[PDB]
Amino acid sequence: IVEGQDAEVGLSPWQVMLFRKSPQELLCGASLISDRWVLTAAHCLLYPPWDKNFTVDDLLVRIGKVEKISMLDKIYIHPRYNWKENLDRDIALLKLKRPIELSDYIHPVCLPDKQTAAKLLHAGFKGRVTGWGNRREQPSVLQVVNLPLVERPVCKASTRIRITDNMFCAGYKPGEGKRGDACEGDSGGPFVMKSPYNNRWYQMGIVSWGEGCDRDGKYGFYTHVFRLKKWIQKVIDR
């Protein structure tokens, strides 16, 4: 996170870190959505231009900073994930080897329904991005930044990448008075918003892509969680 601040203890108990198993290195952020399911970006697992195709034997997740380390049973990547062109449908689900124990530092975030998404997804409304990634383009504390949702035509005019309805963008405009963005290591992490209707946090987006971190006139792009909920529902079953 660029231009953020230290998060208070227990601020994001759904925070998950995706780690390379060997050699061990932080790869991506992720989010806890149940005691057994973890949400992240597809490009964190599969990205052929960088020769990246991680399996369950290549990865570990870290949750709760009290801390929990777990293997993955299965990886689910959206079948229409489009890495060649624009990272359309940049979403993947990680099934944990076994269900984890919940605590003060480990707690799942909510997924939004139609009504929640209609209420919260308006240009100007701020969401929250958290992660352990770079401060500049190695924090010892989870970092947090709050960022405003941006008008879709402003998002499209900021980049040459074709923007689909499965993406939104967020971040300050040049001269808006503030800065901030996800950066290397935060990708796959959650963009959350607090609902006034029921006092709960919902994950609205997944850090997907940007063109540099915290650049004037550029915005972060996030996988639109509600619009991919049909696929989320299908794989999780229950």
Binding site: L11, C110, L111, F125, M193, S195, P196, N199, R200, W201
Partner: peptide
């Protein structure tokens, strides 16, 4: 999960975090 989105160290203890108001401020313009 019935208890999703409610953090034990905040909402469950009726303590709001330090930058929550920034989000609620953005809701009313």
């Amino acid at each position: 999960e019935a208890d999703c989105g409610l953090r034990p160290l905040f909402e469950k203890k009726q303590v709001q975090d330090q930058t929550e108001k920034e989000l609620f401020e953005s809701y009313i313009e």
